[PDB]
Amino acid sequence: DLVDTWKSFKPRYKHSHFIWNRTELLTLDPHNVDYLLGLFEPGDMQYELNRNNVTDPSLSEMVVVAIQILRKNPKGFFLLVEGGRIDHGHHEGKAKQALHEAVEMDRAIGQAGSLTSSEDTLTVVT
Amino acid sequence: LVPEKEKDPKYWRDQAQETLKYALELQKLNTNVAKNVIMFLGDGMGVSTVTAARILKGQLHHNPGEETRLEMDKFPFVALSKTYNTNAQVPDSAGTATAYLCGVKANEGTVGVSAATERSRCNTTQGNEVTSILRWAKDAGKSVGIVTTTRVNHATPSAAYAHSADRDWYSDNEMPPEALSQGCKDIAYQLMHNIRDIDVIMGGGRKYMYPKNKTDVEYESDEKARGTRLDGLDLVDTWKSFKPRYKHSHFIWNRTELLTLDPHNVDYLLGLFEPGDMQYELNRNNVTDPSLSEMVVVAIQILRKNPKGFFLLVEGGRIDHGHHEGKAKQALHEAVEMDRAIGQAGSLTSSEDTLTVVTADHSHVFTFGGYTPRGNSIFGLAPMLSDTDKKPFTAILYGNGPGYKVVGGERENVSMVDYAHNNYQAQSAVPLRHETHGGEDVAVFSKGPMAHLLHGVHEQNYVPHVMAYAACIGANLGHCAPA
Amino acid sequence: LVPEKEKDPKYWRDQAQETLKYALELQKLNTNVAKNVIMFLGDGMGVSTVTAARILKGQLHHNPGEETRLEMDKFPFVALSKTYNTNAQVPDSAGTATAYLCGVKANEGTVGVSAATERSRCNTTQGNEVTSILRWAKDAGKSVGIVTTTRVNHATPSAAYAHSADRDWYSDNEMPPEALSQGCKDIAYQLMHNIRDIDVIMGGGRKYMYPKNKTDVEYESDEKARGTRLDGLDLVDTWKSFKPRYKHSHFIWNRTELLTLDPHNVDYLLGLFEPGDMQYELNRNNVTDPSLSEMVVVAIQILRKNPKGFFLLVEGGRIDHGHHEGKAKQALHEAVEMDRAIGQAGSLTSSEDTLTVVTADHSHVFTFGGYTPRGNSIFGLAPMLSDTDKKPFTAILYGNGPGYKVVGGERENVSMVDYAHNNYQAQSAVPLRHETHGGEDVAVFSKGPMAHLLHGVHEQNYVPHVMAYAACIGANLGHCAPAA
Amino acid sequence: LVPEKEKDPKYWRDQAQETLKYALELQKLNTNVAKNVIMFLGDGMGVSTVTAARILKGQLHHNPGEETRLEMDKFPFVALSKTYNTNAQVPDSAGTATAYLCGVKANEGTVGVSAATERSRCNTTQGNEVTSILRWAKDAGKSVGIVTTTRVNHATPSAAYAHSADRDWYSDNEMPPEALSQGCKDIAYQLMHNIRDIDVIMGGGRKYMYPKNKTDVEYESDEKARGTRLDGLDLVDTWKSFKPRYKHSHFIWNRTELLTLDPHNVDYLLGLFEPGDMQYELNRNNVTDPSLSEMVVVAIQILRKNPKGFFLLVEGGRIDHGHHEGKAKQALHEAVEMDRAIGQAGSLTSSEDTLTVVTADHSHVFTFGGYTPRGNSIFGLAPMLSDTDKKPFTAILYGNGPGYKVVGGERENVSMVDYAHNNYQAQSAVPLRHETHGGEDVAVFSKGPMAHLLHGVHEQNYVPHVMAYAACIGANLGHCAPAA
Ligand SMILES: *[C@@H]1O[C@H](CO)[C@@H](O[C@@H]2O[C@H](CO)[C@@H](O)[C@H](O)[C@H]2NC(C)=O)[C@H](O)[C@H]1NC(C)=O
Ligand SMILES: *[C@@H]1O[C@H](CO)[C@@H](O[C@@H]2O[C@H](CO)[C@@H](O)[C@H](O)[C@H]2NC(C)=O)[C@H](O)[C@H]1NC(C)=O
Ligand SMILES: *[C@@H]1O[C@H](CO)[C@@H](O[C@@H]2O[C@H](CO)[C@@H](O)[C@H](O)[C@H]2NC(C)=O)[C@H](O)[C@H]1NC(C)=O
Ligand SMILES: *[C@@H]1O[C@H](CO)[C@@H](O[C@@H]2O[C@H](CO)[C@@H](O)[C@H](O)[C@H]2NC(C)=O)[C@H](O)[C@H]1NC(C)=O
Ligand SMILES: *[C@@H]1O[C@H](CO)[C@@H](O[C@@H]2O[C@H](CO)[C@@H](O)[C@H](O)[C@H]2NC(C)=O)[C@H](O)[C@H]1NC(C)=O
Ligand SMILES: *[C@@H]1O[C@H](CO)[C@@H](O[C@@H]2O[C@H](CO)[C@@H](O)[C@H](O)[C@H]2NC(C)=O)[C@H](O)[C@H]1NC(C)=O
Ligand SMILES: *[C@@H]1O[C@H](CO)[C@@H](O[C@@H]2O[C@H](CO)[C@@H](O)[C@H](O)[C@H]2NC(C)=O)[C@H](O)[C@H]1NC(C)=O
Ligand SMILES: *[C@@H]1O[C@H](CO)[C@@H](O)[C@H](O)[C@H]1NC(C)=O
Ligand SMILES: *[C@@H]1O[C@H](CO)[C@@H](O)[C@H](O)[C@H]1NC(C)=O
Ligand SMILES: *[C@@H]1O[C@H](CO)[C@@H](O)[C@H](O)[C@H]1NC(C)=O
Ligand SMILES: *[C@@H]1O[C@H](CO)[C@@H](O)[C@H](O)[C@H]1NC(C)=O
Ligand SMILES: *[C@@H]1O[C@H](CO)[C@@H](O)[C@H](O)[C@H]1NC(C)=O
Ligand SMILES: *[C@@H]1O[C@H](CO)[C@@H](O)[C@H](O)[C@H]1NC(C)=O
Ligand SMILES: *[C@@H]1O[C@H](CO)[C@@H](O)[C@H](O)[C@H]1NC(C)=O
Ligand SMILES: [Ca+2]
Ligand SMILES: [Ca+2]
Ligand SMILES: [Ca+2]
Ligand SMILES: [Ca+2]
Ligand SMILES: [Mg+2]
Ligand SMILES: [Mg+2]
Ligand SMILES: [Mg+2]
Ligand SMILES: [Zn+2]
Ligand SMILES: [Zn+2]
Ligand SMILES: [Zn+2]
Ligand SMILES: [Zn+2]
Ligand SMILES: [Zn+2]
Ligand SMILES: [Zn+2]
Ligand SMILES: [Zn+2]
């Protein structure tokens, strides 16, 4: 049980949670969780156009609380964000899914820009 | 002798009431968290050895000796350790090291494996390994150190990192060809491969790292110091290879390089100062070779950096070898030198966040006593001759060992020899090439967070469990659990 | 050997974590007032003696041995005691007794006096006497008891009541004329006159209580069992003559009497079962004489009456004698017999209000090694022969003593002999008529109220200062003061 | 007593070469960054006070005393401090405090200001304030603490936080209406207002914190213990209000509360244990008042939470008062208390990252002499009588102070009195109500990072410039600068 293994490796004076649906994500107090495991689908998450608004979060919703947690460390943070279903949309030849997957990551890039500062945060998009 | 102050009862009552005051203050238990964790292992340092070593330390200062306090005599909490191996009543060096380093009593001649393993048979090893508190530390992000005066592949240090079926398998030169075909790796090879980020390693075992017949740097004129690996490998080069190229790693081999260093500048240290075991403190080279205290100091200085702390294992080895030769003056002087290291380590850290543990793996058949007067030199004689053979005898006597001397049915008249010599072998009851271990319990000295948990008569494997629970490392971490 | 269950790492990991769990609950420290105090003194039972005895107690049950838990092993708190005398690096039975009973360290050969007293000089006694915890207990209304298997005027029990410049002055027959003329009195006389209402006295030494040449009540024909006193006093009668008559004072001398008595019915007990010392537990007459455990239970049942509590000094006395003789089997069985009495005391008292200490006055040069296999008989042999002279050797070996045996040249081939005998003397390095003591530290075992006050490496005389603090007796009553 | 080992030349040579061996290893200098900085200020601890207190500490363990080693004696590096003020030759507690805590020498009676400020003239305070190492430490992000046995608004502690033109302005009750109307605020007021986040504040002065005529928590019936504040402010409440509410800020006033706190949970501590100064340790109430070592231990445990480090100012301040009263036994026993506290601090910190400094502010005219024999009680007599008047004299003798006593034209035959008494005032050359300070130099004891920088004869204001440089706080940050 690698979810158990993930929990066990963490010192339990810290707050480790693990979640799987969107309600648990938007309920967390980011100021109060140190370790988070969010696995929301058995395989890949659905396309944004096919997302279920109640059981599954968007990419921006995940990126926002992800930044809010990582900021607590005084030494900074590193964050890797993958709008990685653009590729799956192009592979299927469904350009309407690929472009909507791209717009969603751009919305996320805008949210990340509001939660950090150009003066001390470097953001690379490629 | 009788000091004048000890003839006054108020002195002994004043002393006991101060001790009673400190005992009451110790009720405020230290329930902090062991950010750092140091274990001092006196090899063969039984209860009889610590008392004689205490008397020796004071006698070096022209005091009677019995009233001296060792550095470890100042640790607040003392326990007794049942040292027996799972297959040996009188235990050995390796199987005990698995007990106090891994938490599992094992078989004689094995390190890092449970009792399911059989000695020298390798197809009992896989699936039977056990991990050590050194591994538990690094897994939790701490730094780790191995400092010793024996070889780094000797039985006691090897239980920190290795999992071998025979303690004799130093390098692959010392292995049977059957065991190579089964695909088993010697201890020296295992030092550089199981935990590839041991920050500090200091001790001996230089020739088990160089290819066979390759000359040694310090003793080129000698061949018993030559390399031993049929591998043709170079584990010094190999050591340097698993560290990130941008980190500061050094490798030293003499004393000058040790003190030359900037601890604030080294991330990974490797010191191998002799081809095999390091020279007795009483025989050490001031110029070329460091002492155990010197090595402990820069070891702690390097390991102090890690914000999550460190674990350090110091083995005051060669206490064991001294008794094995029957030369008690060497074994006692090795014990006093480890006590200097306990003192230095006590100042470079704080008891508030550093749990330090001092103990032995087993004892020896070492005794002393002839109703000797107060202040009598620990290597001196009893006041009376034998009421059986009208000859003097030394306070120190061994159960067995090479001190047995008989000039044809006649036990040696000791007033004709230098019994206070460094290499003198006190008499024994049964002659052997080497004096044997002892099955009696050993003492456990502890100071720091949760040091009070080592309280009574414990099985030897219980020791690392406590040090694990205090640092919040290993298989149980409920000490850091806000209940 | 390897027992099957110990091949699993889960067995050691589980067993250890249960020991950790108990040690964590030990943090909540017993701080109640010691209503009762019990001291067990294994005379000469050093660290190496207790382990060999631990193996013996388990091998008498057909188990390997090393995994046995002695009744004293179950005690929560262990400390180490520095045993040296003011006068001696390697201490004796008497000077150490003054340390752990009177709180002051003294010269070898003396009891109940400071180091200002010089041995065998009587004019050095007055002004330098030190009192015992057995007296501090009595001055606080507690009942007091002394149970031993040596003479009741031996060195160890006599520190609780006597003050002498020589342990050797058992009766007035043994003192020099200058000592008698100088005013001081023999130890046996002191047992009846110093503190004249000791509740329980048991052990040997009967021949020192009756006038000279008085035939013993047991051995009418044994000369050496005849009385010794030149005084003429019947010290058993002097004992009877000192008690309040509205109390029941019984003198007994055999085992049938001891178990005939009704505890809740007898107030003062003096039981002297042998002329000299008591027989070893292995040589003990099952009919005429009682075991030490049988004496401890009868002693306790009499001493629980007093509402204020009691103090009881028990002495596994003949362990020291066993090592002095080279007979490891006798010394080891004496130790095991004392441990049985420890568990006997743990069932008749509660650790809630009873502080129990088990320790020793000093050690011996007794060892056992040889890399013996797991489960090997403690009296058995080492697996290998001597690589020097090809002949085997026992696990148990001594430093010095009468076990030395070179047969006109070579040392004895012990396959021809009886090394498991009760009276076998294991080989030694230096031949002596009597094996000597060890200078090493000895172990302290503590359970009960404030037992945690004995924690590390301590001077020997620190022990009664702790017992007297928990019991709220002696010089310092701060534990019963209005505080916390 | 002439100890037998000291008659052997090899003993002194073996020892000297052992001292020589250690000094050679000290050449490997400790040049790490001083994460923590601790300063022990022995108020009035002259050079003669240190040797006298050293002999005292050893004689409390039944030793001769002169060979005894104080905890401060074991400090590696020693220096001398020129203690004069700009105002005065023989300095005072306030002007020196500005020197060794703010790095600037000042006029007597003026804490926290320079020599441009004239004493009692407050129109000269603005523009002349100098900040302390405690403020530099707070500005660097470190926790800061103040532990003393005097009022927390006394001269020595007030230099760490206040800027005042007069040491006598404890509260507004003791200020002149000119200085109050001119706009200046009390040391007590500045304690809660200048640095509002001082983590640990422990000592005396409970009365200078509460409105006038409020009764004390300890001594309700004492009129002299009632509050003094004329502006009606509960400064103890002002303290709590300035801290955030999620923080654990406690305030305590007796020993039971201090030893009951869990340091891991308290964020800001304020301990005020007496209305004014605290009792001498020889007069302390073990039930209601903590010792100076007990306060130092808990303070270090709280300040240790900060990852950036901490600064602690400890003041064994009543050494100075004991000398002023002419009572050496009090002043000497005050010093031994600070030395015990120094030993506790060295147990809770490491020399690898903690620079500890022990010094005084000035000395007294206290001497001991008379060619006393080895081991002579420091409070005892000289071995001979006077050549002149044939009466004995004590080893301790003062230059001036209340000890001056002539029993009608002739000085007092001290064989009639208790010269060893706790309150005995040894005789002086000139009668005064209070013994005066001394102009001689004091010692400085340094251990930890860069401790070797305090090396020779130094102006007293040099001390805080070294401690700040080692901790990378204040003006010069060159120790943490990257290159070299
Ligand atoms: C999202 O996950 C939470 C947590 O598992 C769900 O809440 C649980 O719901 C079940 C049944 O409704 C209850 O038995 C549990 O007690 C609930 N747990 C908690 C912590 O609230 C929630 O129902 C899930 N929502 C969706 C839409 O899947
Ligand atoms: C300790 O080891 C160092 C390192 O090998 C020795 O310094 C070397 O000395 C030789 C000739 O003296 C030079 O060729 C090397 O270049 C030196 N190496 C370094 C790293 O400086 C040093 O001599 C040794 N000291 C002793 C006493 O053996
Ligand atoms: C043990 O050897 C010593 C000498 O080393 C013997 O004692 C000496 O004997 C000679 C002649 O018999 C005397 O001149 C000396 O005065 C003796 N004393 C010393 C201190 O040398 C001793 O007798 C020997 N023991 C035995 C049992 O033979
Ligand atoms: C134990 O001692 C008692 C007392 O001396 C013995 O009992 C008495 O023996 C006498 C004659 O031997 C009888 O006349 C009494 O009736 C006995 N009294 C009692 C109460 O039995 C007893 O014989 C001794 N026991 C042993 C086993 O020696
Ligand atoms: C020690 O004594 C034993 C027993 O007397 C010797 O063992 C026997 O030796 C004979 C021949 O010497 C064999 O025939 C027997 O079988 C042996 N006994 C057993 C039980 O095997 C032993 O040889 C002696 N050793 C020495 C060095 O004297
Ligand atoms: C030390 O101070 C504490 C706190 O003020 C005192 O504890 C209080 O005692 C009073 C009785 O005088 C009780 O009514 C309070 O409930 C107690 N408070 C707490 C938090 O327990 C304590 O009595 C003082 N001790 C001394 C010796 O003065
Ligand atoms: C100082 O006082 C002491 C005693 O107070 C005087 O010495 C004693 O005087 C009495 C009375 O004559 C004698 O019995 C004692 O023998 C004297 N000595 C001692 C040690 O008590 C002493 O004479 C006084 N000195 C002066 C100069 O007044
Ligand atoms: C949720 O899903 C429904 C069904 O596709 C859709 O009508 C709606 O726009 C989605 N978003 C919401 C409710 O925010
Ligand atoms: C390996 O272990 C098995 C155990 O079933 C044993 O039978 C076999 O002999 C071992 N290997 C060799 C080469 O002996
Ligand atoms: C080591 O130093 C000591 C110091 O005096 C000296 O006596 C000894 O000869 C030296 N030995 C070596 C091997 O350098
Ligand atoms: C003790 O008694 C002896 C015997 O006469 C005597 O010579 C000596 O002076 C006495 N000493 C003391 C201190 O009483
Ligand atoms: C004790 O009684 C048992 C059982 O009757 C007997 O076998 C044994 O011999 C007796 N004890 C002794 C020492 O004889
Ligand atoms: C300050 O005021 C006092 C009187 O209030 C006066 O004597 C003094 O000269 C003034 N000093 C300055 C600098 O104004
Ligand atoms: C402090 O404790 C000591 C301990 O013996 C006692 O003698 C003294 O009277 C106590 N004093 C106070 C004021 O509690
Ligand atoms: Ca989902
Ligand atoms: Ca070398
Ligand atoms: Ca009988
Ligand atoms: Ca108070
Ligand atoms: Mg080893
Ligand atoms: Mg005895
Ligand atoms: Mg002051
Ligand atoms: Zn792709
Ligand atoms: Zn070993
Ligand atoms: Zn060994
Ligand atoms: Zn004894
Ligand atoms: Zn004995
Ligand atoms: Zn001052
Ligand atoms: Zn002053």
Side-chain angles (χ1 to χ4, degrees), chain C residues 41 43-44 93-94 97 100 148 150-151 154-158 315-318 320-321 361-362:
Chain C
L41 221 297
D43 219 301
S93 303
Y100 59 73
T148 178
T150 72
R151 326 159 174 66
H154 189 244
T156 291
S158 61
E315 197 218 358
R318 314 228 59 215
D320 183 69
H321 305 57
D361 48 358
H362 59 70

Short mmCIF file of all heavy atoms in Angstrom, two decimals, chain C residues 41 43-44 93-94 97 100 148 150-151 154-158 315-318 320-321 361-362, ligand 20:
data_model
loop_
_atom_site.label_atom_id
_atom_site.label_comp_id
_atom_site.label_asym_id
_atom_site.label_seq_id
_atom_site.Cartn_x
_atom_site.Cartn_y
_atom_site.Cartn_z
N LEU C 41 21.22 -8.34 50.75
CA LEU C 41 22.68 -8.23 50.62
C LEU C 41 23.23 -9.60 50.22
O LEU C 41 23.49 -10.45 51.07
CB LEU C 41 23.31 -7.73 51.91
CG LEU C 41 24.44 -6.70 51.74
CD1 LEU C 41 25.62 -7.30 50.99
CD2 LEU C 41 23.91 -5.47 51.01
N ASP C 43 26.13 -11.25 49.83
CA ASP C 43 27.51 -11.07 50.24
C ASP C 43 28.49 -11.57 49.18
O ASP C 43 28.60 -12.78 48.97
CB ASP C 43 27.76 -11.77 51.57
CG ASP C 43 28.66 -10.97 52.50
OD1 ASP C 43 29.80 -10.68 52.10
OD2 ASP C 43 28.22 -10.64 53.62
N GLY C 44 29.19 -10.65 48.52
CA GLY C 44 30.13 -11.01 47.48
C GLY C 44 29.53 -11.33 46.14
O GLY C 44 30.23 -11.84 45.26
N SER C 93 34.35 -7.43 54.03
CA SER C 93 32.93 -7.58 54.33
C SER C 93 32.45 -6.57 55.36
O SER C 93 31.26 -6.23 55.38
CB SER C 93 32.65 -9.00 54.84
OG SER C 93 33.07 -9.98 53.91
N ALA C 94 33.35 -6.07 56.22
CA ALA C 94 32.96 -5.23 57.35
C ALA C 94 32.94 -3.75 57.00
O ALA C 94 31.97 -3.05 57.30
CB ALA C 94 33.90 -5.49 58.53
N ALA C 97 30.16 -2.88 54.79
CA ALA C 97 28.89 -2.94 55.51
C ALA C 97 28.59 -1.62 56.20
O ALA C 97 27.45 -1.14 56.17
CB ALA C 97 28.92 -4.09 56.53
N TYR C 100 27.11 0.83 53.27
CA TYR C 100 25.74 0.73 52.79
C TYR C 100 24.71 0.60 53.91
O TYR C 100 23.51 0.53 53.61
CB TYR C 100 25.59 -0.44 51.81
CG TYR C 100 25.96 -1.81 52.34
CD1 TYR C 100 25.14 -2.48 53.25
CD2 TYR C 100 27.11 -2.46 51.92
CE1 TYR C 100 25.47 -3.73 53.73
CE2 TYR C 100 27.45 -3.71 52.39
CZ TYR C 100 26.63 -4.34 53.29
OH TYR C 100 26.96 -5.59 53.77
N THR C 148 19.79 -13.79 58.24
CA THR C 148 21.03 -14.15 57.55
C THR C 148 21.27 -15.64 57.69
O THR C 148 20.60 -16.34 58.45
CB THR C 148 22.22 -13.35 58.09
OG1 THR C 148 23.42 -13.76 57.41
CG2 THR C 148 22.38 -13.58 59.58
N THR C 150 24.77 -16.55 57.89
CA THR C 150 26.03 -16.59 58.61
C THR C 150 25.74 -16.39 60.10
O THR C 150 24.59 -16.41 60.53
CB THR C 150 26.99 -15.53 58.07
OG1 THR C 150 26.54 -14.23 58.46
CG2 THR C 150 27.05 -15.60 56.56
N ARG C 151 26.80 -16.21 60.90
CA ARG C 151 26.58 -15.82 62.28
C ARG C 151 25.86 -14.49 62.34
O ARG C 151 26.03 -13.62 61.48
CB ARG C 151 27.90 -15.72 63.04
CG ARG C 151 28.98 -16.70 62.63
CD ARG C 151 30.34 -16.18 63.06
NE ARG C 151 31.42 -17.14 62.82
CZ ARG C 151 31.84 -17.54 61.63
NH1 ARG C 151 31.29 -17.09 60.51
NH2 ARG C 151 32.83 -18.42 61.56
N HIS C 154 28.40 -11.88 62.49
CA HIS C 154 29.29 -11.74 61.36
C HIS C 154 29.39 -10.27 60.96
O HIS C 154 28.66 -9.41 61.46
CB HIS C 154 28.80 -12.60 60.18
CG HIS C 154 29.76 -12.67 59.04
ND1 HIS C 154 29.47 -12.16 57.79
CD2 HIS C 154 31.01 -13.20 58.95
CE1 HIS C 154 30.50 -12.37 56.99
NE2 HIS C 154 31.44 -12.99 57.66
N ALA C 155 30.31 -9.98 60.04
CA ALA C 155 30.61 -8.59 59.69
C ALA C 155 29.40 -7.88 59.11
O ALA C 155 29.08 -6.75 59.50
CB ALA C 155 31.79 -8.54 58.72
N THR C 156 28.70 -8.52 58.17
CA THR C 156 27.62 -7.83 57.47
C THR C 156 26.44 -7.51 58.38
O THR C 156 26.02 -6.34 58.43
CB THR C 156 27.18 -8.63 56.24
OG1 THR C 156 28.22 -8.59 55.25
CG2 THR C 156 25.91 -8.05 55.65
N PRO C 157 25.85 -8.46 59.12
CA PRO C 157 24.71 -8.10 59.97
C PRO C 157 25.08 -7.20 61.13
O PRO C 157 24.22 -6.43 61.61
CB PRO C 157 24.18 -9.45 60.45
CG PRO C 157 25.38 -10.33 60.45
CD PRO C 157 26.17 -9.90 59.25
N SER C 158 26.33 -7.25 61.60
CA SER C 158 26.71 -6.51 62.80
C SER C 158 26.84 -5.01 62.56
O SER C 158 26.86 -4.25 63.53
CB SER C 158 28.02 -7.06 63.36
OG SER C 158 29.07 -6.91 62.42
N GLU C 315 20.38 -11.14 54.23
CA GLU C 315 21.74 -11.35 53.74
C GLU C 315 21.87 -12.76 53.17
O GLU C 315 21.81 -13.74 53.91
CB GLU C 315 22.76 -11.13 54.86
CG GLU C 315 24.18 -10.93 54.36
CD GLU C 315 25.21 -11.60 55.25
OE1 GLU C 315 24.82 -12.20 56.28
OE2 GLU C 315 26.41 -11.53 54.93
N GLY C 316 22.04 -12.85 51.85
CA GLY C 316 22.52 -14.08 51.26
C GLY C 316 23.97 -14.26 51.63
O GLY C 316 24.87 -13.99 50.84
N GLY C 317 24.21 -14.72 52.86
CA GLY C 317 25.53 -14.57 53.46
C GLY C 317 26.58 -15.48 52.87
O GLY C 317 27.74 -15.09 52.71
N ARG C 318 26.21 -16.71 52.53
CA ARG C 318 27.18 -17.74 52.19
C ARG C 318 27.59 -17.74 50.72
O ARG C 318 28.23 -18.69 50.27
CB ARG C 318 26.64 -19.11 52.58
CG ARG C 318 26.04 -19.13 53.97
CD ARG C 318 26.54 -20.30 54.78
NE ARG C 318 27.99 -20.31 54.93
CZ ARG C 318 28.73 -21.41 54.97
NH1 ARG C 318 28.19 -22.61 54.87
NH2 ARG C 318 30.05 -21.29 55.11
N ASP C 320 29.63 -15.28 49.60
CA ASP C 320 31.03 -14.92 49.81
C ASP C 320 31.84 -16.13 50.24
O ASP C 320 32.94 -16.37 49.72
CB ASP C 320 31.12 -13.80 50.84
CG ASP C 320 32.55 -13.32 51.06
OD1 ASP C 320 33.12 -12.70 50.14
OD2 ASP C 320 33.09 -13.55 52.16
N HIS C 321 31.31 -16.91 51.18
CA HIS C 321 32.00 -18.12 51.63
C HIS C 321 32.21 -19.10 50.48
O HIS C 321 33.24 -19.77 50.40
CB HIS C 321 31.22 -18.79 52.76
CG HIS C 321 30.94 -17.89 53.93
ND1 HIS C 321 30.26 -16.70 53.81
CD2 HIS C 321 31.24 -18.02 55.25
CE1 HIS C 321 30.15 -16.13 55.00
NE2 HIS C 321 30.74 -16.91 55.89
N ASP C 361 28.13 -6.07 48.82
CA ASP C 361 29.16 -5.26 49.45
C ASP C 361 30.42 -5.17 48.60
O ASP C 361 31.13 -4.16 48.65
CB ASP C 361 29.51 -5.83 50.83
CG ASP C 361 29.74 -7.33 50.81
OD1 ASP C 361 29.59 -7.95 49.74
OD2 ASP C 361 30.07 -7.89 51.88
N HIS C 362 30.69 -6.20 47.80
CA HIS C 362 31.88 -6.27 46.96
C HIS C 362 31.73 -7.48 46.05
O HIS C 362 30.67 -8.12 46.01
CB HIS C 362 33.15 -6.35 47.81
CG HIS C 362 33.18 -7.52 48.73
ND1 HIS C 362 33.31 -8.82 48.28
CD2 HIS C 362 33.06 -7.60 50.08
CE1 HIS C 362 33.29 -9.64 49.31
NE2 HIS C 362 33.14 -8.93 50.41
MG MG E 20 28.91 -10.93 55.96
#
